[PDB]
Amino acid sequence: SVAHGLAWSYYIGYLRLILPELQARIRTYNQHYNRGAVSQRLYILLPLDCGVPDNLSMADPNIRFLDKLPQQTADRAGIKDRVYSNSIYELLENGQRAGTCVLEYATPLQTLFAMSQYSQAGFSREDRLEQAKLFCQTLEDILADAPESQNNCRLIAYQEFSLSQEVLRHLRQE
Ligand X SMILES: COc1cc2cc(C(=O)CCC(=O)O)sc2cc1OCCCOc1cc2sc(C(=O)CCC(=O)O)cc2cc1OC
**Of 13 and 61, which has the nearer Cβ to ligand X?**
13
Considering CB distances under 5 to 8 angstroms, the limit depending on partner class, which of ligand X, its own copies, none binds residue 29? none
CA distances from 34 to 66, 82, 93, 157 (A): 10, 25, 21, 29
Say how many residues touch ligand X, by CB under 6 A: 11
| Strand, helix or coil for residue 145 | coil
Segment interacting with ligand X, rule: CB under 6 A, options 7-15, 26-34, 41-49, 58-66: 7-15
Establish if 10 lies at the interface with ligand X (CB under 6 A).
Answer: yes
CA distances from 68 to 65, 96, 108 (A): 8, 21, 22
Distance CA 113, CA 96 (A): 34
Choosing from 21, 61, 71, 82, the residue that interacts with ligand X (CB under 6 A) is 82
Choosing from 14, 66, 146, 158, the residue that interacts with ligand X (CB under 6 A) is 14
HSE-CB of 156 using CA atoms within 13 angstroms: 25
**Of 34 and 137, which has the nearer Cβ to ligand X?**
137
| Strand, helix or coil for residue 74 | strand
Site residues (vs ligand X, CB under 6 A): 6, 9-10, 13-14, 76, 79, 82, 107-108, 111
